[PDB]
Amino acid sequence: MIQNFRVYYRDSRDPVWKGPAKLLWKGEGAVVIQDNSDIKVVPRRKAKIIRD
Amino acid sequence: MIQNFRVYYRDSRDPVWKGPAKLLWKGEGAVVIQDNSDIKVVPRRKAKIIRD
């Protein structure tokens, strides 16, 4: 059901937002994404769902 | 498309397999699962897809 959606997220070294990422898994207060060629887990409260 | 499937995986502190887990994301050589109440990423080459 996830079509074209971008997501922003902050790093643990700086509360500064980071470039957009691809949205893959979406359920509880957590969202799986992929910035470079590596998938990682990010708390939903530290990410934002933007539409493409 | 993921119905009832269990997955085993080894830890980084010991090449010993670990209890079964729930299969959620499935794509490249990586698989997202959930053992306790926390989701983590595990390389597909370090996990096994078992049917329920």
CA A29, CA A25: separation in Å to the nearest integer?
11
Residue A38's closest CA among A26, A50, A21, A16?
A21
Q: Within 10 Å of residue A25's Cβ, how many Cβ atoms?
A: 16
Q: Within 10 Å of residue A10's Cβ, how many Cβ atoms?
A: 15
For residue A48, the enclosing domain spans: 1-52
**Which of the residues B32, B37, B38, B44 would you substitute to probe the A interface, choosing the one with the greatest number of A C-beta atoms within 10 Å?**
B32
CA A18, CA B25: separation in Å to the nearest integer?
23
**Which of the residues A1, A23, A32 would you substitute to probe the B interface, choosing the one with the greatest number of B C-beta atoms within 10 Å?**
A32
Q: Which of residues 1-52 of A touch B (CB under 8 A)?
A: 24-25, 27, 30, 32, 39-41
Q: CATH no. for residue A52? A: 2.30.30.10
Tell me the DSSP string of B9-44: EE-SS-SSEEEEEEEEEESSSEEEEESSS-EEEEEG
Phi, psi (deg, nearest 5) at residue A46: -120, 20
**By three-state DSSP, how is residue A38 classified?**
coil
End-to-end CA distance of chain A: 14
- Give the distance from CA A3 to its chain's centroid: 14
Residue B29's closest CA among A25, A38, A42?
A38
Residue B37's closest CA among B18, B14, B21, B17?
B21
CA A5, CA B24: separation in Å to the nearest integer?
19
Q: How many domains does chain B have?
A: 1
What Cα–Cα distance (Å) separates residue A21 from each residue in A28, A40, B38?
18, 11, 22
